[PDB]
Every structure is written in structure tokens, then in C-alpha cells.
Design a protein around this motif. Structure first.
Motif, PDB file in Angstrom:
ATOM      1  N   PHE A  66      12.779  18.139  29.291  1.00 23.83           N
ATOM      2  CA  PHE A  66      13.771  17.770  30.142  1.00 23.83           C
ATOM      3  C   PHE A  66      13.363  16.430  30.911  1.00 23.83           C
ATOM      4  O   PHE A  66      13.533  16.090  31.850  1.00 23.83           O
ATOM      5  CB  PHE A  66      14.071  18.671  31.223  1.00 23.83           C
ATOM      6  CG  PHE A  66      14.586  19.935  30.606  1.00 23.83           C
ATOM      7  CD1 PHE A  66      15.064  20.110  29.218  1.00 23.83           C
ATOM      8  CD2 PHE A  66      13.873  21.108  31.049  1.00 23.83           C
ATOM      9  CE1 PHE A  66      15.420  21.209  28.881  1.00 23.83           C
ATOM     10  CE2 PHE A  66      14.339  22.487  30.749  1.00 23.83           C
ATOM     11  CZ  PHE A  66      14.861  22.622  29.708  1.00 23.83           C
ATOM     12  N   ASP A  67      12.593  15.525  30.210  1.00 24.57           N
ATOM     13  CA  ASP A  67      12.005  14.089  30.579  1.00 24.57           C
ATOM     14  C   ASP A  67      12.818  13.203  30.042  1.00 24.57           C
ATOM     15  O   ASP A  67      13.582  13.368  29.174  1.00 24.57           O
ATOM     16  CB  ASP A  67      10.420  14.059  30.229  1.00 24.57           C
ATOM     17  CG  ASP A  67      10.043  12.982  30.935  1.00 24.57           C
ATOM     18  OD1 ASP A  67       9.257  13.158  32.212  1.00 24.57           O
ATOM     19  OD2 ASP A  67       9.501  11.939  30.323  1.00 24.57           O
ATOM     20  N   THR A  68      12.897  12.332  31.279  1.00 25.17           N
ATOM     21  CA  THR A  68      13.814  10.870  30.745  1.00 25.17           C
ATOM     22  C   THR A  68      13.044  10.167  29.520  1.00 25.17           C
ATOM     23  O   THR A  68      13.758   9.807  28.746  1.00 25.17           O
ATOM     24  CB  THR A  68      13.719   9.924  32.020  1.00 25.17           C
ATOM     25  OG1 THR A  68      12.517   9.844  32.661  1.00 25.17           O
ATOM     26  CG2 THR A  68      14.774  10.343  32.905  1.00 25.17           C
ATOM     27  N   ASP A  69      11.661  10.189  29.631  1.00 21.96           N
ATOM     28  CA  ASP A  69      11.248   9.529  28.390  1.00 21.96           C
ATOM     29  C   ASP A  69      10.750  10.551  27.307  1.00 21.96           C
ATOM     30  O   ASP A  69      10.426  11.677  27.634  1.00 21.96           O
ATOM     31  CB  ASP A  69       9.832   8.825  28.759  1.00 21.96           C
ATOM     32  CG  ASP A  69       9.334   8.094  27.783  1.00 21.96           C
ATOM     33  OD1 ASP A  69       9.979   7.456  26.990  1.00 21.96           O
ATOM     34  OD2 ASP A  69       7.965   8.035  27.647  1.00 21.96           O
ATOM     35  N   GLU A  70      10.770  10.081  25.989  1.00 23.61           N
ATOM     36  CA  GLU A  70      10.549  11.168  24.818  1.00 23.61           C
ATOM     37  C   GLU A  70       8.911  10.868  24.287  1.00 23.61           C
ATOM     38  O   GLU A  70       8.719  11.509  23.509  1.00 23.61           O
ATOM     39  CB  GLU A  70      11.701  10.975  24.014  1.00 23.61           C
ATOM     40  CG  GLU A  70      12.761  11.473  24.169  1.00 23.61           C
ATOM     41  CD  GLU A  70      12.517  12.939  25.328  1.00 23.61           C
ATOM     42  OE1 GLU A  70      12.275  13.850  24.521  1.00 23.61           O
ATOM     43  OE2 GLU A  70      12.927  12.673  26.294  1.00 23.61           O
TER      44      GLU A  70
END
Lengths: 46, 39
Positions: free
Chosen positions: A38-42
Motif C-alpha cells: 500500500f505504498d505510493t511508490d512501487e
């Protein structure tokens, strides 16, 4: 020095010691699964 | 008793009696997925 014509009687020599040491070092970090999903960055892990 | 002591006195039926699965009554609708990445 003074060598008389008679002679008969001096110098010495010394050596000194050097000592080192090995010390351990390190650290670490933690992360949860939800942090990665659930992070903005992958590419946060990279 | 009998002629001699018998060890096994009960046949163990390998096939067990497990309960069935409750019918998925309410869960009979659409299944939309959430994107793993972000969101």
C-alpha cells in the motif's frame, strides 16, 4: 665515543611494538508487507 | 473373554465424517479486485 689506545670497554638496540584492533560494526532495518503493498511508490524496496 | 487376549477389538474406519460446507448464500455477487500496487 673515545677509543683510547688501550681499549677493552658499549651500545644497545631496542624495538617497539604496534598493536591494532578489529571492531565489529553493522545495522539493520525492518518493513511490513503492508508497507510494500500500500505504498505510493512501487520501487521503494529498490 | 475368549481363547486368548486379542489386541485389536475395534475396526477403525479410515474414512471420517466431516461436515459439509455452508452454502455461500450472501456471497453470490460480483468480485471486484483492488490493485495490489499503490491504492
Amino acid at each position: 665515543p673515545a677509543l683510547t689506545e688501550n681499549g677493552g670497554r658499549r651500545v644497545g638496540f631496542t624495538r617497539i611494538q604496534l598493536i591494532g584492533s578489529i571492531k565489529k560494526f553493522g545495522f539493520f532495518y525492518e518493513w511490513t508487507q503492508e508497507a510494500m503493498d500500500f505504498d505510493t511508490d512501487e520501487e521503494l524496496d529498490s | 473373554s475368549s481363547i486368548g487376549p486379542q489386541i485389536r477389538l475395534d475396526y477403525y474406519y479410515k474414512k471420517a465424517l466431516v461436515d459439509a460446507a455452508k452454502e455461500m448464500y450472501f456471497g453470490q455477487l460480483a468480485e471486484v479486485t483492488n490493485m495490489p500496487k499503490n491504492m
